[PDB]
């Protein structure tokens, strides 16, 4: 639909100001273009991929043993083993490719608290690497739901890590300091933690701005 | 131009402290049984005393008296 109220004008005013950084880490668009398109995989295909991955890992183990202790089988069989290890590597690559947009959709929930969207996406990707290393065809779960826990716990760990790339905007420090002072005063005089309505009353701003600014606090 | 003398200077800080105490009353008047609430249980004097102490301890206009000699004071 069509609306050009004052709120939309203010939103575009903000957008033009935010657009002054070209390759902003807060923008996933280039990352989405880099993902491309790979279809969502059903349970049978995912268990197939995991089976190939484990087979390739065991083939790598045996091939590493035979590369040292002699006892090498003729080259014709060694070539099939050399094929299995490559197949396992490819299976791991495909299984990771299948869930980058899952990582993105899990990361989008943590934006606005200090870390850039792409950094959260990298942490989620590493959580996904952790997931593929623990997945088990015996347990029978869908890989998406299983890896979701690993992605979210990795994102939380990075968020809850004392050393993080918190990159708060320059044009928010002053209002955050004012928020802190006013919340402190209201806590000291009201007898309890102030609800955002009281804060908005004191700061002369809409309450949802209070809830938005409070996300940057830590 | 006009002189904001000692009395008005103290009055302004009293006003600020009473403004804080007024918010205190606005809150704890609406968080207690209407039977139990009493004037003395609605009032917290600490903001007013703190404001007066702040004036007399930190305000640029409150100054150590120049006791060099009687004329200086």
């Amino acid at each position: 639909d069509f609306v050009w109220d004052e709120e939309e004008s203010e939103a575009l005013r903000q957008a033009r100001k935010d657009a002054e950084l070209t390759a902003s880490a807060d923008s996933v668009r280039a990352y989405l273009k880099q993902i491309g398109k790979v279809a969502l995989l059903n349970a049978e295909e995912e268990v197939e991929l995991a089976k190939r991955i484990e087979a390739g890992l065991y083939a790598t183990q045996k091939l590493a043993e035979l590369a040292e202790k002699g006892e090498k089988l003729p080259v014709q069989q060694r070539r099939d083993m050399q094929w299995i290890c490559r197949d396992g590597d490819r299976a791991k690559n495909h299984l990771l490719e299948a869930n980058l947009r899952l990582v993105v959709s899990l990361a989008k929930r943590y934006t606005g608290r200090g870390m850039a969207f792409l950094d959260l996406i990298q942490e989620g990707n590493l959580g996904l690497i952790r997931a593929v290393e623990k997945f088990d065809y015996t347990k029978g779960y869908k890989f998406s739901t299983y890896a979701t826990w690993w992605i979210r716990q990795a994102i939380t760990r990075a968020m809850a890590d004392q050393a993080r790339t918190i990159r708060i905007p320059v044009h928010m420090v002053e209002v955050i300091n004012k928020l802190g002072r006013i919340q402190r005063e209201l806590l000291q005089d009201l007898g309890r933690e102030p609800t955002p309505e009281e804060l908005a009353k004191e700061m002369d701003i809409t309450p949802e701005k209070v809830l938005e600014i409070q996300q940057y606090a830590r | 131009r006009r002189l904001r003398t000692v009395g008005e200077l103290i009055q302004n800080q009293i006003r600020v402290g009473l403004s804080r105490m007024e918010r205190v009353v606005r809150e704890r008047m609406t968080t207690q049984d209407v039977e139990a609430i009493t004037p003395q249980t609605l009032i917290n004097i600490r903001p007013v005393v703190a404001a007066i102490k702040e004036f007399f301890g930190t305000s640029q206009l409150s100054q150590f008296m120049d006791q060099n000699n009687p004329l200086s004071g």
Binding site: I166, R167, I168, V173, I176, N177, Y216, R218 | -
Partner: protein
């Protein structure tokens, strides 16, 4: 930015700022082996 919501100082800031390396020598500084006192006329003194 650090925990105080303030930016971290980088390598450039070592020499960029108003108290940077390039401006340290220029500003006045306190010196040892010096004193200060009120002056009076020594009319009996020689010029040296």
């Amino acid at each position: 930015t650090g925990p105080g919501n303030r930016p971290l100082k980088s390598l450039s800031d070592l020499l960029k700022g108003k108290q940077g390396r390039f401006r340290q020598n220029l500003l006045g500084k306190r010196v040892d082996y010096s004193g200060r006192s009120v002056i009076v006329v020594g009319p009996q003194l020689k010029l040296h």
